[PDB]
Amino acid sequence: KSLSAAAQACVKKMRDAKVNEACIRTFIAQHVMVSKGETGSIPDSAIMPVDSLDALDSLTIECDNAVLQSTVVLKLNGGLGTGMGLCDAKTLLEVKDGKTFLDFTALQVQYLRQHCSEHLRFMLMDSFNTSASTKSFLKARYPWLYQVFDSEVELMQNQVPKILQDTLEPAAWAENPAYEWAPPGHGDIYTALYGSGKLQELVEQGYRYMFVSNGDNLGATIDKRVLAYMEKEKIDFLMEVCRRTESDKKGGHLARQTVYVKGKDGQPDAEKRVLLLRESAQCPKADMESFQDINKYSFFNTNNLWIRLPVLLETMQEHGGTLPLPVIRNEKTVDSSNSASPKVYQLETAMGAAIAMFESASAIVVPRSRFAPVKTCADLLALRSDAYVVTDDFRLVLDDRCHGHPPVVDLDSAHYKMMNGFEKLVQHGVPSLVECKRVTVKGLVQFGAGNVLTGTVTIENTDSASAFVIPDGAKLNDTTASP
Ligand SMILES: O=c1ccn([C@@H]2O[C@H](COP(=O)(O)OP(=O)(O)O[C@H]3O[C@H](CO)[C@@H](O)[C@H](O)[C@H]3O)[C@@H](O)[C@H]2O)c(=O)[nH]1
Ligand SMILES: [Mg+2]
Numbered sequence: 001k002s003l004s005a006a007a008q009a010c011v012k013k014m015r016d017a018k019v020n021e022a023c024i025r026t027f028i029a030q031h032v033m034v035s036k037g038e039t040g041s042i043p044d045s046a047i048m049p050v051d052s053l054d055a056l057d058s059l060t061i062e063c064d065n066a067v068l069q070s071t072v073v074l075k076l077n078g079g080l081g082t083g084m085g086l087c088d089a090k091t092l093l094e095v096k097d098g099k100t101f102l103d104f105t106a107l108q109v110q111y112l113r114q115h116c117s118e119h120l121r122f123m124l125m126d127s128f129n130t131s132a133s134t135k136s137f138l139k140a141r142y143p144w145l146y147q148v149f150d151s152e153v154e155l156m157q158n159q160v161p162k163i164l165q166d167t168l169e170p171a172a173w174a175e176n177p178a179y180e181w182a183p184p185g186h187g188d189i190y191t192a193l194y195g196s197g198k199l200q201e202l203v204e205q206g207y208r209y210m211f212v213s214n215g216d217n218l219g220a221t222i223d224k225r226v227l228a229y230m231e232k233e234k235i236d237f238l239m240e241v242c243r244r245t246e247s248d249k250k251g252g253h254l255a256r257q258t259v260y261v262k263g264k265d266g267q268p269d270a271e272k273r274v275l276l277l278r279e280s281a282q283c284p285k286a287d288m289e290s291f292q293d294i295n296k297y298s299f300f301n302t303n304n305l306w307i308r309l310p311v312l313l314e315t316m317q318e319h320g321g322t323l324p325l326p327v328i329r330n331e332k333t334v335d336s337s338n339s340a341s342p343k344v345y346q347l348e349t350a351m352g353a354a355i356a357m358f359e360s361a362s363a364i365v366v367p368r369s370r371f372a373p374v375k376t377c378a379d380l381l382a383l384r385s386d387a388y389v390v391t392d393d394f395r396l397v398l399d400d401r402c403h404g405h406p407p408v409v410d411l412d413s414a415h416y417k418m419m420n421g422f423e424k425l426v427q428h429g430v431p432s433l434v435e436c437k438r439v440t441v442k443g444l445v446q447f448g449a450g451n452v453l454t455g456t457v458t459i460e461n462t463d464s465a466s467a468f469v470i471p472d473g474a475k476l477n478d479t480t481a482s483p
Pocket of ligand 1: 076077078079080125126127157183184185186213214215216250251252253277279300301302303350351352373375
């Protein structure tokens with residue numbers, strides 16, 4: 001009904017493949033935007049810094065029991081960790097000896113069920129890539145989650161067609177047609193919830209809040225103070241943000257614009273702050289200077305998000321059965337491996353962008369303890385190290401000796417970008433980093449078995465025709481060590 005041939009070709013392919021209609025409506029609206037020149041770019045000049053938020057450490061009151069019992073926890077688990085050379089779910093990586101992201105995730109759920117709300121609802125948003133392996137893991141390790149995996153745990157994200165940059169038609173790939181489809185980013189959570197009927201089912205069952213976080217962030221759990229704050233302040237969507245550090249490069253920051261409140265009765269001048277998310281992908285590429293300036297944009301989205309479910313549901317129903325999140329136009333080739341395969345756009349959205357979709361939306365500053373991202377092998381190095389400790393409620397948080405500062409880890413991306421390269425680097429043990437402010441690894445190198453790094457430490461191999469192996473027991477303090 002009024003679409004371009006290319007947009008109609010997408011609808012047809014999606015209907016043929018039995019893609020849920022909410023996903024088709026959502027995708028097509030993005031497609032229309034893209035056909036009018038939209039890229040998701042948010043230039044510097046269109047936004048301003050946010051310089052005032054409440055902090056969670058300013059709160060004390062915990063929510064009532066009804067509210068608590070009404071809260072569902074969901075962990076995102078649909079991505080690929082392709083920058084870490086992973087082909088399966090990142091959450092199946094080991095984080096501490098013999099314990100994976102999924103283990104700590106399951107243990108957190110069990111803790112909450114033993115001490116807070118015995119029937120706390122727990123979900124995982126999976127994709128076709130991660131579903132099987134996740135389900136398999138829970139069957140072996142956490143039978144009580146496996147038993148209700150299909151019925152209540154797993155939410156399956158949609159897949160949407162990759163579209164040719166040429167014409168915006170759906171891309172075909174005869175050698176492997178599965179590569180014609182892509183996951184639409186974690187912003188798809190709202191569309192998959194709504195289109196599957198699970199959102200309405202949850203609201204029917206008496207659930208009122210959902211707390212979502214990234215599968216790679218084991219600092220995130222429900223804080224009953226946030227829920228009491230959302231109840232008091234009548235907030236329908238809340239983003240947790242952390243004060244941004246130099247390591248916060250892959251993700252998004254909070255920003256504002258100013259709008260002008262209803263009408264002009266009383267005075268024209270008065271205006272309201274509107275909040276939004278800018279992902280790295282949304283910064284104009286020749287202006288990453290805007291994005292990477294941690295002073296200017298110092299509130300980094302953790303992706304720990306709180307949503308009031310009935311409000312989400314009514315907002316989507318009243319907007320054509322979709323949530324109109326800003327499209328992010330990702331550029332790839334249809335076989336991302338093969339740069340001789342046709343160039344495509346992959347239309348995606350980020351779930352934190354939903355802060356722009358509700359009148360009551362806000363953000364709160366949380367301590368770093370709620371944010372332990374693992375986007376790279378360098379992050380994983382810190383996480384596995386004694387810089388991070390396991391709390392009684394099964395979060396991974398910095399040791400108190402760190403003073404809330406994660407070690408900065410700068411690993412050579414020729415050798416350690418891929419999980420195969422990283423794992424060779426820590427073959428003989430993971431170095432103590434609890435007292436390291438900054439470790440930098442240059443050229444090919446291998447840690448020894450006793451290592452302890454204190455202060456600022458560069459390990460530089462200029463040779464790397466030959467691996468620079470660190471002696472066991474070695475101690476490096478404010479020093480460059482080289483062969
Ligand atoms: O289609 C997708 C893509 C991602 N994921 C999952 O979503 C989570 C976040 O994805 P990831 O690629 O690791 O992060 P980004 O999307 O780059 O960044 C998100 O997380 C950052 C904090 O780490 C925030 O700063 C950004 O705003 C936020 O969008 C991970 O569990 C992924 O597995 C899905 O489930 N489906
Ligand atoms: Mg991902």
